[PDB]
């Protein structure tokens, strides 16, 4: 009975651990989706910049919007975080307890 | 977190910085009114382009914040 | 959980304040849109004056 | 936020100082049958054995 | 003069409050365990 109770309590805690893990993953996925949308807008207006009919002054505005989008990508990459942990800023491997 | 900022750039725009500051066409008439007027228009267009770049940044930021709030 | 409360309220209020950014930006854009018409009028009047 | 004027920061500061006054008041006034728990640093001893 | 790092100081205050709260929770748990042990010992004696 004591061993059963120990294992049961361990699994009950591991359940909340796994819920924390899925929350972390979803929070990361949101920022990835935002970066995706920014990249799509960049490729859009790069396609506009590609044609030679554009003058240099127009290309300056296109480059300005590129720089704004890149700065937005930089900010979303850097200062996004969950539980005070910059998940996208620095490469790393994270462990999640799942068992008793 | 601290040190989170989106910077809007504002440059003062009057007739003085735009160029002319005084326009004569009846004769002393300016030598190249067309070029000065075109450059004045181009500066306004550049400022408008920067403005558009900043609305895009701001709305991307606000939609990101709204998305993140629900997850947290 | 306590720190998540701070994060949630901070993010919500930060978005609320960021909306003022688009407010200022759109007001300024309207102002320049107003100015541009006068410049175009002067530009197409100069050629007549010439 | 940079959009706020000086009066906005003044109102924010007034609200902030009212809050901080509440923190100090609640810290000073809370007491358990004559012992001020948060007014001063200290330790309490409890007997649990014969 | 506006504080240099307001949010950092406020977060540090949050951490201090949380630690003080956690110590109280721990002492509450230990006191409750002590009470139940004392009751069982009283019954045995």
């Amino acid at each position: 009975a004591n061993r059963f109770t120990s294992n049961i309590k361990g699994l009950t805690q591991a359940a909340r651990n796994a819920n924390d893990g899925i929350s972390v993953a979803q929070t990361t996925e949101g920022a990835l989706s935002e970066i995706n949308n920014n990249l799509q807008r960049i490729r859009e207006l790069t396609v506009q910049a590609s044609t030679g009919t554009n003058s240099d002054s127009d290309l300056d505005s296109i480059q300005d919007e590129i720089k704004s989008r890149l700065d937005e990508i930089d900010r979303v990459s850097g200062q996004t975080q969950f539980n005070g942990v910059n998940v996208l800023a620095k490469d790393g491997s994270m462990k999640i307890q799942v068992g008793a | 977190n601290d040190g989170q900022t989106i910077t809007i750039d504002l440059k003062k725009i009057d007739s003085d910085t735009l160029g002319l500051n005084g326009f004569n066409v009846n004769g002393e008439s300016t030598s190249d009114p067309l070029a000065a007027l075109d450059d004045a228009i181009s500066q306004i267009d550049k400022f408008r382009s920067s403005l558009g770049a900043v609305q895009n940044r701001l709305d991307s930021a606000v939609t990101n914040l709204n998305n993140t709030t629900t997850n947290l």
Side-chain angles (χ1 to χ4, degrees), chain A residues 71-72 74-81 86, chain B residues 1-7 57 61 64-65:
Chain A
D71 284 25
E72 182 65 26
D74 279 307
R75 198 287 302 289
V76 176
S77 176
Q79 293 82 17
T80 195
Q81 54 77 28
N86 291 318
Chain B
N1 72 268
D2 195 358
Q4 296 299 107
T5 302
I6 296 169
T7 294
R57 177 184 212 67
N64 178 303
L65 304 194

Side-chain angles (χ1 to χ4, degrees), chain B residues 20 22-25 28-41:
Chain B
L20 283 71
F23 205 54
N24 183 312
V25 287
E28 276 287 357
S29 43
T30 316
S31 63
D32 285 334
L34 314 179
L37 276 186
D38 291 331
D39 292 27
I41 287 183

Side-chain angles (χ1 to χ4, degrees), chain A residues 49-95:
Chain A
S50 299
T51 297
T53 190
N54 310 345
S55 67
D56 273 291
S57 313
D58 185 341
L59 294 174
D60 305 329
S61 69
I62 317 304
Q63 172 61 303
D64 281 321
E65 181 146 350
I66 298 298
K67 276 314 290 212
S68 75
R69 288 291 184 164
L70 286 147
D71 284 25
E72 182 65 26
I73 278 172
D74 279 307
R75 198 287 302 289
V76 176
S77 176
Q79 293 82 17
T80 195
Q81 54 77 28
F82 174 110
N83 188 45
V85 187
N86 291 318
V87 298
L88 270 45
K90 175 241 192 173
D91 172 342
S93 177
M94 182 179 72
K95 301 293 187 292

Side-chain angles (χ1 to χ4, degrees), chain B residues 8-14 17 43 46-48 50-51:
Chain B
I8 306 196
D9 189 359
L10 296 201
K11 308 169 288 318
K12 52 172 311 295
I13 301 299
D14 63 358
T17 81
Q43 175 190 356
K46 203 57 46 183
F47 194 20
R48 298 220 290 215
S50 160
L51 281 195

